[PDB]
Structures are given as structure tokens and as C-alpha cells.
Symmetry: C3
Subunit: 554 residues, 3 copies
Amino acid sequence: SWNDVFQYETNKVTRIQSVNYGTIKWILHMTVFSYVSFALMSDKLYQRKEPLISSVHTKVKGVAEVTENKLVHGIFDTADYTLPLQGNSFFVMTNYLKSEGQEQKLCPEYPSRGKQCHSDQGCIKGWMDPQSKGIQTGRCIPYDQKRKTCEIFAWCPAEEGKEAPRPALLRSAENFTVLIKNNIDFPGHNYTTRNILPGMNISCTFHKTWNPQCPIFRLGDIFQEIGENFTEVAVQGGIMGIEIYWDCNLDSWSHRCQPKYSFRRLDDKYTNESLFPGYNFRYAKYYKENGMEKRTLIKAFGVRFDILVFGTGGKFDIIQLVVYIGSTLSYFGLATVCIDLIINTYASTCCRSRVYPSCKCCEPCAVNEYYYRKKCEPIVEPKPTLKYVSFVDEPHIWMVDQQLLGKSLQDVKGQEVPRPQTDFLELSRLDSPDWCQCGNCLPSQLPENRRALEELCCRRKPGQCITTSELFSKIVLSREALQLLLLYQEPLLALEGEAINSKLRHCAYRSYATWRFVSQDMADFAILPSCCRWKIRKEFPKTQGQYSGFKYPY
Amino acid sequence: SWNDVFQYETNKVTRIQSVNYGTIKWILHMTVFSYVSFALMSDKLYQRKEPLISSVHTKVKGVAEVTENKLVHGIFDTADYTLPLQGNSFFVMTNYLKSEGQEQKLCPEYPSRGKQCHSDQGCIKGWMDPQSKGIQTGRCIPYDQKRKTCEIFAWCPAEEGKEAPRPALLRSAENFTVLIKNNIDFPGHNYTTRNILPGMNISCTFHKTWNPQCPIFRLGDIFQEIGENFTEVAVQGGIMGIEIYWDCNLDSWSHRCQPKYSFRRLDDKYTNESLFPGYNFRYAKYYKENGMEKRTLIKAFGVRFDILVFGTGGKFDIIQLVVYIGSTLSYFGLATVCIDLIINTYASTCCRSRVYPSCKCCEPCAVNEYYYRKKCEPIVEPKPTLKYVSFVDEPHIWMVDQQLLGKSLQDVKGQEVPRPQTDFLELSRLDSPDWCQCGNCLPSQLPENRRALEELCCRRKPGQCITTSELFSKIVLSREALQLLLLYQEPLLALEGEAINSKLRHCAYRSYATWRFVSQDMADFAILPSCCRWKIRKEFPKTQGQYSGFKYPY
Amino acid sequence: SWNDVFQYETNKVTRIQSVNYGTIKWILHMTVFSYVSFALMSDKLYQRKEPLISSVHTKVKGVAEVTENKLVHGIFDTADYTLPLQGNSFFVMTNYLKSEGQEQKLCPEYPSRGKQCHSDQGCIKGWMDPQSKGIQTGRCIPYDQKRKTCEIFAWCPAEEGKEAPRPALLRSAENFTVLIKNNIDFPGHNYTTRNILPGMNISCTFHKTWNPQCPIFRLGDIFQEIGENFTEVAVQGGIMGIEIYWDCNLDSWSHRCQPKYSFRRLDDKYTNESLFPGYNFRYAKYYKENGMEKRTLIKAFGVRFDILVFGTGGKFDIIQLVVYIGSTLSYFGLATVCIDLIINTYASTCCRSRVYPSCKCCEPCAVNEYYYRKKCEPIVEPKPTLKYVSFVDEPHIWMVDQQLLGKSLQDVKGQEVPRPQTDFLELSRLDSPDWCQCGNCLPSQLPENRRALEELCCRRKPGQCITTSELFSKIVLSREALQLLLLYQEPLLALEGEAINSKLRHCAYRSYATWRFVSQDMADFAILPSCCRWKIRKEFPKTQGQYSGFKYPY
Ligand SMILES: O=C(NCC1(N2CCN(c3ccccc3)CC2)CCOCC1)c1cccnc1Sc1ccccc1
Ligand SMILES: O=C(NCC1(N2CCN(c3ccccc3)CC2)CCOCC1)c1cccnc1Sc1ccccc1
Ligand SMILES: O=C(NCC1(N2CCN(c3ccccc3)CC2)CCOCC1)c1cccnc1Sc1ccccc1
Ligand SMILES: Nc1nc2c(ncn2[C@@H]2O[C@H](COP(=O)(O)OP(=O)(O)O)[C@@H](O)[C@H]2O)c(=O)[nH]1
Ligand SMILES: Nc1nc2c(ncn2[C@@H]2O[C@H](COP(=O)(O)OP(=O)(O)O)[C@@H](O)[C@H]2O)c(=O)[nH]1
Ligand SMILES: Nc1nc2c(ncn2[C@@H]2O[C@H](COP(=O)(O)OP(=O)(O)O)[C@@H](O)[C@H]2O)c(=O)[nH]1
Ligand SMILES: *[C@@H]1O[C@H](CO)[C@@H](O)[C@H](O)[C@H]1NC(C)=O
Ligand SMILES: *[C@@H]1O[C@H](CO)[C@@H](O)[C@H](O)[C@H]1NC(C)=O
Ligand SMILES: *[C@@H]1O[C@H](CO)[C@@H](O)[C@H](O)[C@H]1NC(C)=O
Ligand SMILES: *[C@@H]1O[C@H](CO)[C@@H](O)[C@H](O)[C@H]1NC(C)=O
Ligand SMILES: *[C@@H]1O[C@H](CO)[C@@H](O)[C@H](O)[C@H]1NC(C)=O
Ligand SMILES: *[C@@H]1O[C@H](CO)[C@@H](O)[C@H](O)[C@H]1NC(C)=O
Ligand code: NA
Ligand SMILES: [Zn+2]
Ligand SMILES: [Zn+2]
Ligand SMILES: [Zn+2]
Ligand SMILES: [Zn+2]
Ligand SMILES: [Zn+2]
Ligand SMILES: [Zn+2]
């Protein structure tokens, strides 16, 4: 409880003194660090970004001389051509159609797009024409001497459908100027600025290169900066956007909050004639003449200038930086993942069999086998079916994970596992059964259902028994050695009774298993051959009992 | 320096050939990968998202026939009922109250909500009534034959408080159409589009299902799509929002930037009468009649249509993808964490004592003890108080981490630790003290303050001494074996002088400690019993000195 | 294939029972968890945040009494001083200059800022003055009896440049009220609310403390809340922002979506006179008098109130939470990184040599050497140049990684490595060459080009040969021991032919290498001295062949 809490687990590591792997690791670490730092700096991922709230105030300067037909020469000032800024847009009239002295009465509709009538059949009665802006009476009447148009109750004289005058009457509007004052705020960052600061000169007009910070814009300059023709757009009008981009850095050490001005036509050039190309609106001036209520309809074409203000303000935020660093921390395991993959791949035996002979250049990479055997310790799941057998004729060990369904273990033929290398430091001291192949194996006395477990020979092929080897007597059948091992485990062991024979048998089994399998993990589930088993059992006979044989440790 | 930099550390790993653990690991890896990929695809976390900047241009089409009372029949066209788009909203008049020929003079205020006066006391003088829109004079005068209302200096005839006409005069506005042109831009992504593209037909009107991309909307259709009644709203007016959502994907392979249109009433239906329900504004037309400056006040009720354009444009960004992948990489350790937790929990001994007998189904999970002992190597902090003792009668070892404050170590009673399994591969070769329990322990010759350190018996309970065992003489008291060990450590060691006895004593102590504790970590802080210690010391007596005893290695 | 997929790799770990390290680990884990949770809660990083779409509807209440000079006393109601909300801003007239009965004709320009003319030279002809708002004719004419100003074709009488009246005519506008209704929506979250809900009283007016949720604002209160003087601003006008911040939490358990009102002047106080200080616009009322088309120009100064609505709505999103948790997961490795760094640093030998004597307080930290030797297993890259040598006179081993370019290995002098501690548990059993220093080394029989490999002596300095040690005969030259090892490796080995001598030689080399280097990794690339090599080779002579010597295992 108390002790379990006060524990620290650290990973066991193998440190490789390799030039190539160290170089690869450092190259990858530096690459990851460089990319992560570059991304952090470029995208300012350490900054919290706040959108701006903007207020725009515009002022148009300019007077237009207009001459029309008696001959009437007049001047238009801001009140005569400008619609005050509403929201973030201002309108400049560039052309107009005037219809003076309109009365609500009957009149022929203007002949637009060949809207001629030859009979009263074509003209419906009671039909509200949104183009003509009147109610048809069902009659066709002469609009002039030659052509006739459907009659309508409307504001008369009706002139809707008349084309915009060409050239535009207020062409001189290209020479008008607009002063744009832009106040922006980031309330989360509690910062505010404006596009005009002390030091600027009113004698400036905006230029992309010479005066990119002057907020005074000539309208024609706006149009010609983005390849638009003010003279043409003036006839039918349009919508132009003045984009103000605020890429603002609010850190004291990198403070930069300046506006960037740009221009973009917002109305489609090739809008279909049916979809009301350009920009215009109809303005009515109502008055009384004699006893008649009249109105002067001005179809004003012009350019609506939409001032579009957008941008973000970035300020250092520790939480954003921490989240980014945490997001990128796992990328620093790239070197370990790559080098471990290299070690795993170049540890395979196949590489030596096929790859290396074909490509002798990659021969020095065989050292990865040593790294893998120093890094990885394979272990198999211990289950009752797990058995290990060893044949003296063969050089390797065999692992059997399959149940013995009556077939002798000698024939059940599991997979092959290598015998571990023995600790040389520790070794610096001094009617036979059909499945048998050595003439010493005896039939098992276990129950038939599990008799195949012990049906194992010391060798696969005929030959001399392992029991005949000199080492077998000393390692296994030497009573002195087994007694010494017993004393080592139990110094005060009493060498009396029938248990001493059982203990010697167990230690002899363990000794053979350790000798022929080395690994304790394999020795624990090893299976002794019948010959060696029975030689051990007769060296230490059991008096009045039946041998139980191998049992599952778990 | 140079070599230390060229190093790679790799973790030591134990590979388990387990079907269940491999299956669990792969299931968890696939689950994590699937969720991470699904989140990335669904939220487009590989995309950087930019808000759009929008421009809206509206055009209302329609004519309304209005008949009022002589009987006056007229028609309203766009100039008579429409307020041009300003910002992103347009207004359509649906009802109106007209007050013609107003003069700044004295008049009785309109009797609204029973605003009657019976005496001059109720009518204050100089009071500016924002409802009546005039200055009270303090007098109560007859507004008509029967009822009287307070006098005010105001625009007269004053009609403020008159209810909106019912039914609405411009009901036919439900049949008006609005064409909405929406230009949107993502400047960061340098992309722009509009809601009208070549191919569309003007003969379309919007429908949620049939024509969801037609930008021509009948106002009544707008109202009835969201269960609003245009006829009723027309009387007092309201505010309707046309929402244009641009969920735009700007990747070439998944390009989809189309508008979705929706409608939402923006004015509260149940606004209190005191809070100005609906939508109206007062418009003044000033003129001169005779020598008098007059004005026609139109209280125009109608629907303000707010065009609300919102959305984001997503474009693939490598940094966003990298940050997301880094954020999600640590989730791939889930399999390892879960399997390690399983191994730790099922390695506990308790599971066998209580859990397994109750639930025999979870018995095969005992293999986790083997995995844990193959994965974890416990070690304790080496401190001067750390001691290990072993009693031949007992089967385990005892660890004492507490200072001996004069109490004999035999009685100080630390915790219990298991004795490690000996390497069987290496073992394949050939007036007694009160605290004593074997009759061979002698009083310690160390200073009293630290005499309790050596006050240890080979056993807890009375019995035969471990020294009497045969193995004790060979392992510990055999001069030949100790000399051989000395030669192994120091091949050219000179067996002369008084140092040879000290070296043999040290090696005998080490041999006993290794034999009775196995582990070198426990043997280093082991404590020899007094009996064995003094038997060793008399086998190799010290000539002219005092034994120093156990010392702290660190 | 099938088996390789069903594998789980778990890291080998050493568990340290340390109070300090466990405490540090838990402190760091708790610190990381606390900061991560605090950041998640404070920034709502579990929430997805959506910007709001807003609609604003304003209503101004108030009447202003204005007296001017005959003496004219009038009242202004909303239609006389208010511009209806367009976009999200409303204008209140606070001052005005009136120019009645303007005709397009010739007139002298108003004498503003001393715009006097003394000769026709100063007055250009055809010059469009945007300040005077007329076309100069090139003549200088008397504007009055004393001063003269340039003639212009313009709307006359021209009064542009006249200063705003002081005090402001519509001062009483400070007492006007505005009701602001704000509808906001988060469409992604499908949530909508408004700033007015049932329960509020119309008899409220906004106050920062008493009535912070009342949407009725007195204009003078707006100005005086942020230290602005309405009386002064009324003369020339200005722009004020009413900021409505919606910090909205849309989770059911933490639902809070309320508006916060604030005020900010948006027009620069100290705008240069040339940059049009304040806020005004010119409004033209056109009419016909007699047979002349005239206009009344009102330069209306006032306050434009910009209603600025901003905010975000946060709603729990599982993906955002998952991404944040993944981003922060890697920070939980801080404890491991720090403790491992501590172990690595305090494991260095230098600490004992210099740091500990200077600062004895940090002496108990020497236990980190044990932790490091229990955590890390150094291994070097096995390459053909890798050799290990051991000198009996010296106590350590020497590693040589450099090619022998004809120089004897005895003199090539590589680095020093410690000899590993032998397993005491396993040890519990029973004309001389110029480079030589023992009198037993013989010249190598290998080819000259690689003769320096075997040119190694058992010791660096003159002395007795290691071969003379008793252990050398038993470990190396004992035929019985080598035969026993052969049987252990190959139980049925046939001790016949010339191969038995070669096998005994190989095992003798291995035995010496294991004895003098312990570690199998160092023993594999160890180099035997010439004396021991040739003693072994003469104990087991080769009959009719040439010894091949050491070979690279890989
Ligand atoms: O009437 C004419 N121009 C005024 C316009 N608006 C009217 C509405 N104002 C306004 C201002 C503030 C708030 C609300 C509203 C702004 C200005 C017409 C609509 O489009 C922009 C200009 C106009 C057109 C074409 C030929 N003539 C004349 S009048 C004239 C007569 C004689 C000589 C010169 C001009
Ligand atoms: O005056 C009337 N309607 C015009 C309205 N606005 C005026 C201002 N215009 C405008 C345009 C551009 C820039 C700046 C301003 C837009 C249009 C009145 C305000 O609300 C919307 C319509 C009106 C109402 C009710 C009965 N009659 C009549 S006039 C009439 C007379 C005889 C026959 C029919 C209509
Ligand atoms: O004309 C005067 N005030 C009306 C203002 N606007 C006009 C345009 N309307 C409007 C409404 C809806 C849509 C489109 C447009 C709003 C109101 C003038 C521009 O600035 C705001 C007020 C004005 C000024 C200064 C002295 N007098 C008088 S008229 C008057 C005459 C006698 C007595 C009192 C006032
Ligand atoms: N590894 C291994 N152990 C065995 C084998 N046969 C018996 N044993 C061990 O010996 C013990 C059984 O004792 P045994 O000598 O067969 O007869 P017993 O006196 O009736 O118990 C068990 O604990 C087994 O682990 C074998 O073939 N291989
Ligand atoms: N593990 C262990 N080592 C001991 C013990 N007693 C003595 N030693 C070791 O023996 C050395 C002291 O020598 P010692 O034989 O007691 O007498 P000395 O000749 O005066 O040094 C120290 O290095 C101890 O590590 C013991 O009880 N346990
Ligand atoms: N570690 C080590 N191994 C050696 C050395 N000399 C020979 N060997 C081993 O002995 C084998 C060569 O056999 P050797 O006795 O020299 O003569 P051979 O009969 O011709 O092969 C090789 O596999 C070497 O690994 C040495 O100096 N050090
Ligand atoms: C703009 O000004 C220049 C220089 O005064 C003049 O040449 C040009 O004609 C003007 N443009 C128009 C459309 O009047
Ligand atoms: C602009 O359009 C006008 C037509 O109004 C044309 O006369 C002129 O040549 C055009 N200018 C350019 C640069 O294309
Ligand atoms: C709308 O149009 C239909 C069909 O022309 C007509 O029946 C209906 O009366 C109209 N609505 C109004 C309010 O006039
Ligand atoms: C809409 O309101 C009008 C009242 O102006 C009513 O006559 C009509 O029945 C209503 N329509 C519906 C569908 O509720
Ligand atoms: C505002 O109202 C108060 C109280 O009615 C009055 O004293 C003050 O003069 C008013 N302000 C103006 C500018 O008329
Ligand atoms: C506000 O300005 C006026 C000038 O119009 C001045 O008389 C008054 O004292 C000022 N008020 C304050 C509080 O400064
Ligand atoms: Na991570
Ligand atoms: Zn056999
Ligand atoms: Zn056999
Ligand atoms: Zn005793
Ligand atoms: Zn004893
Ligand atoms: Zn020599
Ligand atoms: Zn020698």
C-alpha cells in the first residue's frame, strides 16, 4: 500500500555505440525540431488569434460638371450624387435617367427590347408587369407615330426600359476621391487602432507602391489598378470592393498592425440582361404641382463601393503554445521508431539468405541481429499444451503447442526453436517400443488417455542412447551431485524416508532439462525421453506408489 | 564526448507469443486508427478554414395596387415601397399611415390607448411626450366632439398612436420577388465565387426541393416556408432573415462551394406593445405650401429582410494535418497501456487466493505472473539502513530498512522477500547469547552503539546450526575453493602476508551471502549470522587487528 | 506469418522502491494533470466555438425643442433628426447648418479659413474646388462689403466652410433614448436568442451596475460612461460604438448566453481639420419654386451610433476534447524524463570525484549509479576492427576499435573498459619478442600483413606469465574439462580424428576469453596473448595444417 505508491518504474534500455544510428537519430531529431519550430513561427501557433470588429467612415470629395439637353449645364456636388455610407458601403452616381412630372394615370409602356404591340390580344388586362412597373389595361395604344405599346396604369410618363445614357453623364466621378477612415478593435486582446495616425499628409493619394498607406483613393485609380474601365462601368454601374486586410501582430516585440488595401470588382461583368446587370436604383422625389401629386423618378446608375474589412490579431498565449508543443512532442519518437524498424528488419535471417548475396553492400548491416538479440527477449504463452522436446541427433529443440489426441509425442512434430547458448562462464568448471530408436525406452505406465505424453525417444533416428553418455551419469544419475543441490536449496534437509528418492528424481529431471534445453522457460515445459526418465526412476525407485509424470506448472 | 554523442538507446522489450494479447492489441490499434481517421474526415481537420467576406446585391420586382379613401386607386412600384439595400438588408413597405400637410403648431394629441384627458391637471406643461412626439402645454382640449386629449406643440395634425390599417394596404407584396446576388470571397485561400453562375434560368423561383439554388425568392414563399403568415405580418411589419450558408470545400478533388438558403424570423412575435412590436419607420417629406413649411409623415410598416451570409472555406493545410496527427499519435499507446494494466492486475497473488476460486473461468489468466516476472525487475533503494537476513528454518528472506536503535537485529523483524531461484544451469556441477537459537553464536566485538547489527542467529527457533551442514565447509570454509576464486579474480595473487586471510574471509562472506540470498543485490546488503561469521573468522583468524564487520557499499 | 501477427511487445522495466522518486513522479503527474484540467476548463477546449450571426433593430425616442433666428421655435421628432438603422448603425442629428433656396448659378464662395481673394490671379478658371463645391470662373468678387472671395458656379447661396453652430442646436438629444433589440444565432449549434426576454420592464434604462441588461440607453449616459462629453461632440458630431458581446455557453449544465454592453468612441478626437473631424453629411431637399428648380442643403452634424455585436457560442464537442487530450497526453512523460535525467546525471563518476567532496549534501544521490547499471546495458557495434585485450598486471580491459596498420596490438593502445563482475553464484563451486614481457610469447605464424593481430603479450610490463598460474592449467589446459564441455554441448561427440584437437583448442580459447573478460560480448572479440595461444596450441597440436587465428564472427 504505502510502499506501492512510492515506486518509480524506468524502462530498461540497451545503449548502442553506433556512429550510423547516433547520426540518424540526431539528424531526425534536428529535422523534427526544425519543422516544428518553422511551423510555430510561420503560422504563429503560439498566438491566439482574434477577429477584428471594424467601423468605417467614408467621405467623398468632388464636383461633376454635367451638360444635357434647351441646353442645361449644371454641377453635381456630394449631395447630388452621393448616398451616405450605410453599413460599410457608399454609392456614387455615375449616370442617371430622369423622368419628371409623373402622375398616376394611364400611359403607353416604353418600347423596350422591341416590346411592341400590334393587337389588343397580346396586351393582357390586369397584368402587373414588373418591368414596365404598371398594370396593363388590355389595350394596345401608340407610344409614338410609328410604334405602339401596351397601355398601363402607372406613373406616367413611363420610361422604364430606356437604356442608360452613353457616355455616362457623371464620367468625371473617376476623378472623385474618397477618404476612408477605418477603426478596428480586438476586444479580447483589448487593442484598438485606426488606419490614420499622426504624421500622414492629406496631400497624399493612395498608390500600391508609392503611397500604400494613404487612405485617400481616386475612384478611377481604384478601377485601373485591377484592370477595370471606369468610363464603361459608369454607364450601367457596378459594385467595387475596397478590401482592408489587417494582419496584426500584437506582441510587443513583433508589433505590426497595419492595413493592406486591395480592390476587387464584386458585380459580375457578364450578368445576363435579364438579371439586371450593373448597379442602379430608382429614387422618387414627390411633390405637388397645381392640385396634382407628382414625382420625379431618377434611375441612378453608379458604383456601390463596398468597404470590406477583415483580419485577425495575434497575441502570445501560453495555452496555445503548450497545446502545440504537446501535439508535436510525439513526433520526436520518429528516430526511435525508424531505428527500431531498421534493427528489426535487418535482424531477420532471410536478409543473409537472399538479400545479402544479391547486394553485398548491405552486409555490414548484419550487426542488427546482435542488437535485436540484445533488445528483445521472446517468450511464449505458458499453456498446458506447451511442451519442449530435444533430440540428441538433432541440434535444435522442438516446441509442441498442439494437444496429443492419442498420437505419440515422438510423431506429433511441432515447430523448431534454437537451443540457447549456455553460460560459458558457468561452464568454466570441471520388444522395444515402435516409436523408440535407442533400445532403452519403455512403455509408459500412465493412463492410456495421456500415455502419448511420455511416448518420446531421446533421438529421432536409430543410434546410441543419450543415457550411455558419460555426462548423463554425472549430471543426472550422480547421487552426490543431487544431494549437494538439495543441500544448496535446503541446507538442513533430512536424507531419510521415501521423500528423498522423490526429491532426487525431481532434481535429476531438472538437471536433464537444464542440460538439454538451457533456458529455464523451456526446461519448465520440457519433456524427458522415456529412456532417461526410466533410468532416473530406477536409479531412485519409488517404493509403494505410482509415478505422476509431468504436470502443468500453472 | 565524441562517443557519447554517437549513441542510440533502445528499449528492452519482451515479446509475448499470445493470441489474446496480440488480438487485443490489433483490435485497439484498428479502433484508434478508425476513430482518428473518421474524425479527420468528418471535421476536415486536415483543412484550414477561412471565414468568407460577402457582398449582397438585391433587386425587388413587383407592383402593388392599393385602393383607399373620395376613392383613390393607385399603384406602388419599387420606388414607392422599397428602401434600397444598405449594408445587407432591404425593406419592403407593406402598410402605411399617412399624415399630410403637417405644420409646426398646437394640436390635441391623438387619443391612443385611451389617452384621454378630463382636466388640465393630468396634462403637464413643458413635458416632451416621446409617444405623442410633441411638447405638452399643460391644457386639455377636445380632440373631437366627445373625447379630449392633452394639447401639444408638434407637427399637426398629430396622428401618432393610430393603429396600423387592417388589412394591410400592400398585401400584394407577398407576390413581390427579390433577386439576391451574393458574391463571396476567401482571401487567404484566394478564392471567390457567386451564387449565380452561367446556366441558371431567370424563369426560376426558389424552392427548397425543386429549385434550391434559384436566388429569386417570392416574399410570401419565404414566409410560408417557415410557417409565417405574410398577411398578418404585413399589418405591423417584421424582420425576416434570409440566411445564406456557404459550406465550401476548396480542394480540387472535393470541390463543392454552393449556397444553402434558409429563412428565419428575426423579430419577436410576442414583443410587448410597449416595446414597439413589428417593424416600422417614420419618413418625412418636406415641402412648401403657400408661405408655410409643411411635411407629409408616412409611418411605413413593412418587412425588413436581413440577408445573413456566413460560412467557411476549407483548404488542405499540411501543418493542420501534422498537428492533428501529432495530437492523436499518443492514442496509439492505448493497447500497450491496457495490456500492461491487465498483466499487472493478473500478476497479483491475491487473484489466486480469492478471485480465482470464486471465478474459475479466469484461471488461465495466471500466466500473467510469468509475464510480469519477465517484464519487471524490482529493486530497492540502497541505503545504510538496508539489511537482508535469512533463517535456515524459514524458507524466505527478510529485509530490514529500519535503524537498529539498540534492539538486536534478530528481533527487529523487517518485511519478507522471496529468495530468488538459483541458476540451475550453474548448479549442474558436482552461556549462549539470549537471541541465539543454535549454540554457536558469540557476542559481537563491535562497539556497543552498533553491536545490534551483528546480533543475529542463523535461525529464528532452536535447532541445528547451519554451520553443521556439509555444504557450509565446502562453500565457505574450504580454503581451496576460496583460493581458486582469488586466482580467478587475481590470477597472479601472492598467497603471503596477513592480507590473504582477510581476502579469504571476504570471499567466504560473499560465498555464504550468495548461497543464502542468490541475488547479488540482496547479497551485497545481507548480514551474516554470528555463528557463521565467527566460524569463518576462526578458520581465517586476524592476527593483530580488530574486525570491522559489515560496511555500507555506497 | 500467422504467429508473427499474434505477438505483443512489452517494455522491460526496472521498478525502484524509492520514496523520493515516487514522490517526484506523483508531484509531477498531479502538476501536469492540474494544469491540463485548468486549461481545459478555462479556455473551454472541450467546446467547439461558433461565431454568431446578429440582427439589430433600433428605435430612438425623443423630441428636441430648437430655437433659432425673426425668431423661429420648433420641435424635432424622430423623422426630423433620425436616420433609420441601415446595416447596424443609426444616426442622430445633433446640429445642422441650413442653406435654403439654392439655385445652380454664380456666387462668391464662402470665406472659410481666410479664403479671401485680392486679385483675379489667385482665382483659377475652371478649377473644381471640392471644398467650395463649385467651379471657379477665374474672377474675384466681393462676398460682403469688406472681404472678397473667388466666384464659382455652384448651388448658391454657397455656405460651405461655415462652422457648425455652437452651442449645438439639438443638445437635448443627450436625453434621447434608444431601444436596441439584438437577435443572435449560432446556426451550427442551432441556437438562437435575443437580448430582450419576458420579465424585463420598459421603465428601465441601462446602467452598468443597476441595470446592465436593460437594452434602453440614454445617449448622454452612453457618452458619460466612457468619459465623453455629449455637449461638445454634438457641435461637430462623432461616431460611437455600442458593443454587444455575447460570451455564450450552450451546454445545458452550464447554460449562460447573456449580452454584455459596452461603449467606445470610434471617431478620433484629434482628427486634423483637413481630415473632416467629427461626423456630418449633406442632405439635399429638391423642390420647385416659381419656374426655378431649387434645393435646401442641410449639413447635418450628429452622432452615428454603430452597434457592434460579436461573440462565440461554445458547445461540448467530443472530437475537440479528444484532440486536446491527445495533445496533452505526452506531457505525462515529464516525470519519467526528469527522473531518468536525474539518474543519468547522478550516475556519472565525475560527481564523486568533484561534486560530492565540494557538496557532501548530495552524497546520498550516489545510489543513482546502481539504478543506471540496473537500467542501461551498454553495447558497442561489432565490427572487424573491434578487439578486446586484457593484461594480468592491469585490473581493467582495453578495447581497440582502430585498424592495425602494421603496429603491434600490444602498442596500439585503445580505450579502457571495466571487467564485468563475475557471477559469484556460478563461482560457488570448487630471443623473446620485443613486444613480449613474459618470456613465453612466440612470433606469429600468420601472414605479415595481419601479423600484428597476434602480437600481444599477457602483460604490459615485465613479470611472471599468466600461463604459470595454477588456474590456467585447470581452466584452459585441462583436457578433462574441455571434454566435459564438449559432451555438454554434444553429448554423443566422437573423440576421434584430428577435429577433436581443433575443438579442444576452440574451447580452450573460449575458456580463457570468458575467464579474462567475463562478458560473452567482450569475449567474442577478445584477443588471446601469444603465450597462452601457443601453450594451448601445443597442448593440442595441429597435425598437418596452419592455424587460422581469430576471425570476425559477423
Ligand atoms: O436627386 C438627385 N441626386 C441625389 C441622389 N441621393 C438622394 C438621397 N440623398 C440622401 C442623403 C442622405 C439620406 C438619405 C438620402 C442622397 C443623394 C439621388 C439618388 O442617388 C444618389 C444621388 C439627382 C439625380 C440626377 C439628376 N439630378 C438630381 S437633383 C439636381 C437638380 C439640379 C441640379 C443638379 C442636381
Ligand atoms: O413615400 C412613399 N414611399 C417611398 C418610401 N421610400 C422613401 C425613400 N426612398 C429612398 C430611396 C433611395 C435613397 C433614399 C431614399 C425609398 C422609398 C417611403 C419610406 O418607406 C419605403 C418607401 C409613400 C408611402 C405611402 C404612400 N404613398 C407614398 S408616395 C406615393 C404617392 C402617390 C402614389 C403612390 C405613392
Ligand atoms: O430635414 C431635416 N431632418 C431630416 C433628416 N433625415 C432626412 C432623411 N430621412 C429618411 C428616412 C428614411 C429613409 C430615407 C431618408 C430621415 C431624416 C435630415 C438628414 O439627417 C437626419 C435628419 C432638417 C434638418 C435640419 C433642420 N430642419 C430639418 S426639416 C424641419 C422643418 C421644420 C421644422 C423641423 C424640421
Ligand atoms: N520438465 C519435466 N518435469 C517433469 C517430467 N516428469 C516429471 N517431472 C516433474 O516431477 C514431478 C512429478 O514427480 P514424479 O517423479 O514424476 O513422481 P511422483 O513422486 O509421483 O510425484 C513434477 O513436479 C514434474 O514437474 C518431465 O518429463 N519434464
Ligand atoms: N554482506 C556482508 N559483508 C560483510 C559482512 N561482514 C563483513 N563483510 C565484508 O567484509 C569486509 C570487512 O572485512 P572484515 O572481514 O569484517 O574485517 P577487516 O579485515 O577488518 O576488514 C567488508 O568489505 C564487508 O563488506 C556481512 O555481515 N555481510
Ligand atoms: N576470441 C578469440 N577467438 C579465437 C582466437 N584465436 C582463434 N580463435 C577462434 O578459433 C577458431 C579458429 O581456429 P584455430 O584454433 O585458430 O585454428 P584452425 O583449426 O585452423 O581453425 C575461430 O573460430 C576463432 O573464433 C582469439 O585470439 N580470440
Ligand atoms: C479627370 O481629370 C483630368 C485632369 O484634370 C482630366 O484631363 C480628365 O478629363 C478628367 N476626367 C473626366 C472624366 O472628366
Ligand atoms: C473605356 O471604355 C470607353 C467606353 O465608355 C472607351 O471609349 C475607352 O477606350 C475604354 N478604355 C480602355 C482603356 O479600354
Ligand atoms: C398573389 O397572386 C395571386 C395570383 O396572381 C393572387 O390570387 C393573389 O390575390 C395575390 N395576392 C395578393 C395579396 O394580392
Ligand atoms: C393570415 O392572417 C390573416 C389575417 O390578416 C388571416 O385572415 C388568414 O387566415 C391567415 N392565414 C393563415 C394561413 O393562418
Ligand atoms: C435633459 O433633461 C434634464 C431633465 O429633464 C434637463 O435638466 C436637461 O436640460 C436636459 N438636457 C438638455 C440638453 O436639454
Ligand atoms: C462639455 O462641453 C461643453 C461645451 O459644449 C462645456 O460647456 C461643458 O463644461 C463640458 N462638460 C464637461 C463635463 O466637461
Ligand atoms: Na503525444
Ligand atoms: Zn528410445
Ligand atoms: Zn534413449
Ligand atoms: Zn545462534
Ligand atoms: Zn547458527
Ligand atoms: Zn609475453
Ligand atoms: Zn605471457
